[PDB]
Amino acid sequence: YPHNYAELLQKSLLFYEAQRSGRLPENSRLNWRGDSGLEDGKDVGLDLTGGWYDAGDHVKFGLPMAYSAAILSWSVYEYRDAYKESGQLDAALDNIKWATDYFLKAHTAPYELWGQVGNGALDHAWWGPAEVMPMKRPAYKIDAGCPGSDLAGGTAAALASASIIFKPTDSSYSEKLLAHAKQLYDFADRYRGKYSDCITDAQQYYNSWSGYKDELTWGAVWLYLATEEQQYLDKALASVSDWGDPANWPYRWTLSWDDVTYGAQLLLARLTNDSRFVKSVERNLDYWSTGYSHNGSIERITYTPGGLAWLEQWGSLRYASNAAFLAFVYSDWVDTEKAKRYRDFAVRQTEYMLGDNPQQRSFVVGYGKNPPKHPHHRTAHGSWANQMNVPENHRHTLYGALVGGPGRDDSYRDDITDYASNEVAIDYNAAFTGNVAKMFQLFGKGHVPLPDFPEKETPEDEYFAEASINSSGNSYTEIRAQLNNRSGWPAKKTDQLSFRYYVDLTEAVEAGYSAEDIKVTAGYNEGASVSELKPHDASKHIYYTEVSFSGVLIYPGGQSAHKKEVQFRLSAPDGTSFWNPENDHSYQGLSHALLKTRYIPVYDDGRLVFGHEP
Template identity: 65%
Template sequence: MSSYNYVEVLQKSILFYEAQRSGKLPESNRLNWRGDSGLDDGKDVGHDLTGGWYDAGDHVKFGLPMAYSATVLAWTVYEYREAYEQAELLDDILDQIKWATDYFLKAHTAPNEFWAQVGDGHVDHSWWGPAEVMPMSRPAFKIDENCPGTEVAAQTAAALAAGSIIFKQTDSSYAAELLKHAKQLYAFADQYRGKYTDCVTNAQSFYNSWSGYIDELIWGGIWLYLATNDQSYLDQALKAVDEWPKDWDYTFTMSWDNTFFASQILLARITKEQRFIESTERNLDYWSTGLVRNGTTERMTYTPGGLAWLEQWGSLRYAANAAFLAFVYADWITDQEKKDQYQSFAIRQTHYMLGDNPQKRSYVVGFGQNPPVHPHHRTAHGSWSNQLTNPSKHRHTLYGALVGGPDVQDQYADDISDYVSNEVATDYNAAFTGNIAKMVQLFGKGQSKLPNFPPQEPAEDEFYVEAAVVRNDTTATEIKAILYNRSGWPARSSKALSFRYYVNLSEVFAKGYTEKHIQITASYNEGASLSPLTVYDASSHLYFTEIDFTGVVLFPGGESEHKKEVQFRLSVPNDANVWDASNDYSFQGLTSNIQKTTKIPVFDRGVIVFGSLPS
């Protein structure tokens, strides 16, 4: 069996959620390429809906998968708190979960009102750029008594109830607040029943409720029972079980849409009822060694390399989810043969993701051998031109993200455009994080997290000028200059950028002329103002003109949005013939070919951000 630094994987998989944060980031933000984003969320409806997680590589805050992911992450702490403590990562995972639960409290604006989504998925998915500079409007969508959404209300109730359990030891007042909202949301979910995508129709193309809402009512009731020990919540969960289809499926697994497979394991543990035990074992047998039915063995499809393969879209996500259920159930049962069977299955699936596969590669970004470097993630890619292919390499490392995964033949292409294989999402990582916590418990003795992690990424040139000589003679110099905003540490918009072009007027002064005789004009201009020559060093006759784009928004969000061009001319009277650009500071190195130059420095609100000044 291969061995990995499971504490390192856990450390990185937790950090993935930090990369998914929306809203005003705290000073403790560890990713220098992430900044504030979505700061106007909720303004269209008069509420503060900032915060929460972007669900995947896009920038929509989808309530159902966010709540599911938060619930599962809280469940992993509920099961493996000691493993997180052993890894010295308990504070980290609680901090990530709290980012989501804080948002749920904001979004629950009345007992029977919850804002289930922020952002239009169709509009959002038509633009490719960093979260910090999203140009589109972000409408908010709610559920209420008139337009209910049982799935998202009950799932959020589960997240808040599970959160109340894990925070109770460290912040009892916060835990009580979470539980209060969980109770209200669960009552709302049960009393006003309705499929949430019938109300939040924008979610239908992305996170449609295929399984209906009964599974969430079961799930929410279980977590409220675990949080309160109030029998009435368990009774509600069991009553909802009676409304679930009688022929319990065993061929699927836990997912953001279907939590029944998770519920039956907890119900088996809580109630000891044989129906839940048998159904759980049918499911886990089918996924692991095979299920014997009517004399034949039924088993999940396996790749040649040993991955339990449910479907192509997020193949590793489903294997990770099934593995987590197997780990949790194996911890509870006393039958040693079954315990070994389920635990071995979960270990093998987890090791496949870490590198024990035919490609001999990790499927976790930033970890192990030959990990993915092209996840389908807008902000990590860092395009400035609204293009999937530009730049050709990601500017940022999305540490800890579990990608979608290989096909049924173990084939995988690390290609950003293949969103089926390379999508990342909060729900992909949730159970996987729990699996790694269990691996720390099993095999992580003596292992430690990486010090000084994550490393601060060195920034590339974010603002700069490219220039070329259009004309140069004894009367004038004409320059074509393009000012760029390709910021990414983090990406940011500016409407106060300028650059300065420096000239030496020694030859002009020698012939009796002064800076007042120099005309500065533009033959092409995308919004700049051109200043008269300003003295920089009178003793050396050094002057500059400021090409100022103040008021013009430049942001790394499109081909024309991230750059502005100006063609400007400095000229003396036509009969003077005293102009000589060869001694001009900013002219040095320029040719007729456009090129980046440090001798035309760039300023943002008057502060130099690129290039160098004349000495």
């Protein structure tokens, strides 16, 4: 595949745009995304709309969201020129601002931080697009009486790092970001505890495995980078004495949404040259790359036979990407032999997930050779039926998403249900996006992004009636109809859907009868009103019945949710024999089997959205 790292960077940022919750801007690039989560915060009296969905679900998990914004801002801080020359800087700022705007909303009071919207069990029990979520979406906070030093520190780091990269183009927004970062850090430092002991739902999805000591250091050093005030460097260095004996600092994991030790110590190593941080950074990157020498033995992470540095079963590519990013940053800082080894490690790991692997395929949706087609992602899939296997192929392309990827033997399945292979998440793409920026800097000379991209997707049929003839006679026709909302471009809730069923009364008028003599009556009925005949074209004796499910919510969210049924009969007076359905517009092609028909037009709030009128 002929790699284009400007296009890749453009796509990775487009994944974050696909993750947006809230009210979307008019110039949104993704026509298959619409407004969603508009009631977020209403249970607690607050506007908590916006931010990112975490993954293929619709929970806004504060700890990985803060981490993702912080790492995204970190790469803009390190590689601004790469973002600039690839044409992606405006997009990178716009996409980070979506998350930091949400943190500002969530940070309502100096010592209060909304850290989740959405309940994991309620959210994940339902498989459908964001715009038509039917369930309650409770909001959860930390505060001084139930704190969260990890969540609060990690969010302070996101605001502090973002404040740096926003200062050149929007200094008043930068000042606001920095003022909230200082308050959140004081919150984190003064009111100590793991946020998942207070937003207990988070224990089941984003548990604070490592505790908060790492976020305390991470927040303080980002505040130092963002202010150059010595007090923050001292606080960072003081917080490191709670890491204990430097000889026992962990080195067998990597930078991750839960453990930012690896980011903090790398930033402190550059600021201090203190051998405690240098050695700990090098133990970690040695372990990930050529092996960590005890002089006795060499200790090294598992590698797949295809060359992927393999931490564990879930989000394997995310881990190798996270490590590659630390390796790139270290390798631009210092001039040691290890810088070259780590730089080569980082490139090879990045080349693996871009296609240089045994599956001979890209692991970035919508990029490269044979990319994953079935990422585990509700809105991109576009189910109308609350089923992961309906439809059998995704309705939309989740461009830029890095999937979980292969197992330890390089095995991989492009399957919507295979969470290990095909999970996607904002933390998966965060360091990865920076790695792409660096690939552009190193190898992307002359790479330009895609113009006018993405093209708007052409919708399939979204609103339509399937209909069949119950019975027909020389004085009546009786119809079975199911009015469908299978929308996806974007999915939309509709509680004012209607259809019209048209007839030609020419044979009636010739027999001495008129529209007055035809009675329209409902039989089995899931909530529609059926009108008497109304004229469509009086000169030609064309009439219709308007069948309206006014106030009935219909939406692409399950087998019953997406359709409503009504059976209705049009009857001439008993004993007459003129009635003739064969010249009736909406009778055309109907059979005794329920089938979509283009001749029963469908209206939403009075607006024609499907089908043909006479």
